[PDB]
Design an enzyme around this catalytic site. Structure first.
Site, short mmCIF file in Angstrom:
data_model
loop_
_atom_site.label_atom_id
_atom_site.label_comp_id
_atom_site.label_asym_id
_atom_site.label_seq_id
_atom_site.Cartn_x
_atom_site.Cartn_y
_atom_site.Cartn_z
N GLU A 9 50.28 25.96 50.97
CA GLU A 9 51.14 25.06 51.57
C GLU A 9 52.48 25.18 50.72
O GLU A 9 53.56 25.09 51.27
CB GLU A 9 50.59 23.59 51.65
CG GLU A 9 49.70 23.33 52.73
CD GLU A 9 49.34 21.85 52.47
OE1 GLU A 9 50.01 20.91 52.09
OE2 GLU A 9 48.03 21.61 53.02
N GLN A 19 39.43 44.71 47.62
CA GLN A 19 38.97 45.58 46.42
C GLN A 19 38.13 46.85 46.98
O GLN A 19 37.89 47.68 46.28
CB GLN A 19 38.11 44.68 45.66
CG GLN A 19 36.67 44.51 46.17
CD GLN A 19 35.75 43.59 45.37
OE1 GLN A 19 35.95 42.16 45.42
NE2 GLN A 19 34.95 43.99 44.32
N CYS A 25 36.36 42.78 41.57
CA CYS A 25 36.45 41.57 42.01
C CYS A 25 37.24 40.60 40.94
O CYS A 25 37.97 39.76 41.18
CB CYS A 25 35.04 40.58 42.57
SG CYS A 25 33.83 40.97 41.54
N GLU A 50 46.21 45.10 40.47
CA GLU A 50 44.91 44.94 39.96
C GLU A 50 44.12 46.35 39.51
O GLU A 50 43.64 46.15 38.30
CB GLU A 50 43.81 44.87 41.18
CG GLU A 50 43.93 43.54 42.04
CD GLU A 50 45.23 43.09 42.51
OE1 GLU A 50 45.64 44.20 43.43
OE2 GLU A 50 45.35 41.90 42.81
N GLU A 86 52.00 44.94 41.83
CA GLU A 86 51.19 45.51 42.77
C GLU A 86 51.95 46.67 43.44
O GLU A 86 51.20 47.75 43.67
CB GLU A 86 51.02 44.49 44.09
CG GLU A 86 49.92 45.09 45.07
CD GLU A 86 48.46 45.11 44.52
OE1 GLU A 86 47.71 44.20 44.67
OE2 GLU A 86 48.24 46.40 43.86
N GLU A 96 41.04 54.97 36.85
CA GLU A 96 42.04 56.03 36.42
C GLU A 96 42.51 56.06 34.95
O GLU A 96 42.32 54.75 34.63
CB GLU A 96 43.16 56.19 37.34
CG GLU A 96 42.72 56.85 38.88
CD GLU A 96 41.95 57.96 38.88
OE1 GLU A 96 41.70 58.29 40.18
OE2 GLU A 96 41.88 58.71 37.77
N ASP A 137 27.93 32.82 43.17
CA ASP A 137 26.69 33.51 43.30
C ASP A 137 26.75 34.09 44.82
O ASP A 137 26.43 32.96 45.56
CB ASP A 137 25.49 32.54 43.10
CG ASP A 137 24.06 33.11 43.49
OD1 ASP A 137 23.99 34.32 44.01
OD2 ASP A 137 23.24 32.33 43.95
N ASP A 162 27.52 36.11 40.50
CA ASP A 162 28.15 37.59 40.37
C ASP A 162 29.23 38.23 41.21
O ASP A 162 29.39 39.20 41.09
CB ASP A 162 26.91 38.44 40.97
CG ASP A 162 26.55 38.17 42.41
OD1 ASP A 162 27.14 37.34 43.06
OD2 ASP A 162 25.77 38.83 43.18
N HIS A 163 29.94 37.05 41.53
CA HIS A 163 31.16 37.43 42.40
C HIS A 163 32.37 36.56 41.91
O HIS A 163 32.44 35.24 42.25
CB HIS A 163 31.02 37.25 43.78
CG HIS A 163 32.27 37.76 44.51
ND1 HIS A 163 32.82 38.98 44.15
CD2 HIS A 163 32.77 37.39 45.71
CE1 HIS A 163 33.95 39.22 45.02
NE2 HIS A 163 33.75 38.05 46.19
N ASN A 182 38.79 35.20 48.95
CA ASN A 182 37.80 36.30 48.57
C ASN A 182 38.89 37.42 48.54
O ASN A 182 40.02 37.37 48.88
CB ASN A 182 36.82 36.43 49.77
CG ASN A 182 35.72 37.15 49.20
OD1 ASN A 182 35.77 37.85 48.01
ND2 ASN A 182 34.59 37.25 49.89
#
Length: 215
Positions: A9, A19, A25, A50, A86, A96, A137, A162-163, A182
């Site tokens: 907002e 990704q 992530c 990223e 970005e 790389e 998780d 894990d994320h 996400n």
């Protein structure tokens, strides 16, 4: 703290990103937090690279597309003395050689804060700092096939996250949830977002590894 919060907002959040087939992530979660903290400070929203994190944060402990931590990314921005945009350092979904160019740096931080492992503390942080980096998780079919509503995985663990994702706010329906951004594109869940169960005994451990950078 407020009953509801949504930093989208106020212009703290950039569009959902993707990704791809690369375990980066942690980089998208970190940039999201940084983009939010840089905005709070300068009033300018710039998408951060990223890829820059993927190729250059190896010394801090990150492993490119094989994994990393949001805190390592923040530490990098700090040790590196900057982070490219970005647009200047495009995402390639593959590791790389580092091509960081200080001429295109648009962000920075002087450290980071790790929030206490309680949803109550995560709530205060979200309300007073802005977007927060957190680990979830997501080790279930259900998370992956998620489309709409409040996500609740009976088999979630508040120990084996894990994320890495981003908490942009929180609220309740007319039942509480964390508004989560996400990095799987907008064709997953609700346009790239998910409403994680809030105040359900740290569901999936949203508050187990929460942190943000100090810019």
């Amino acid at each position: 703290a407020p009953r509801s919060v949504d930093w989208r907002e106020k212009g703290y959040v950039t569009p959902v990103k993707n990704q791809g087939q690369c375990g980066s992530c942690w980089a998208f979660s970190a940039t999201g937090a940084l983009e939010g903290q840089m905005f709070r400070k300068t009033g300018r929203l710039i998408s951060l690279s990223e890829q820059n994190l993927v190729d250059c944060s190896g010394p801090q402990g990150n492993e490119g597309c094989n994994g990393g931590l949001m805190d390592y990314a923040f530490q990098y921005v700090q040790d590196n003395g900057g982070l490219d945009s970005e647009e200047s350092y495009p995402y390639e979904a593959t590791e790389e050689s580092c091509k960081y160019n200080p001429k295109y740096s648009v962000a920075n931080d002087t450290g980071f804060v790790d929030i206490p492992k309680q949803e109550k503390a995560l709530m205060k942080a979200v309300a007073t700092v802005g977007p927060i980096s957190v680990a979830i998780d997501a080790g279930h079919e259900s998370f992956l096939f998620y489309k709409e509503g409040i996500y609740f995985e009976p088999d979630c663990s508040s120990e084996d996250m894990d994320h890495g994702v981003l908490v942009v706010g929180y609220g309740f329906e007319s039942n509480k949830y964390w508004l989560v951004k996400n990095s799987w594109g907008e064709e997953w869940g609700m346009g790239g977002y998910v409403k994680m169960a809030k105040d359900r005994r740290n569901h999936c451990g949203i508050a187990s590894a929460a942190s943000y950078p100090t810019v």
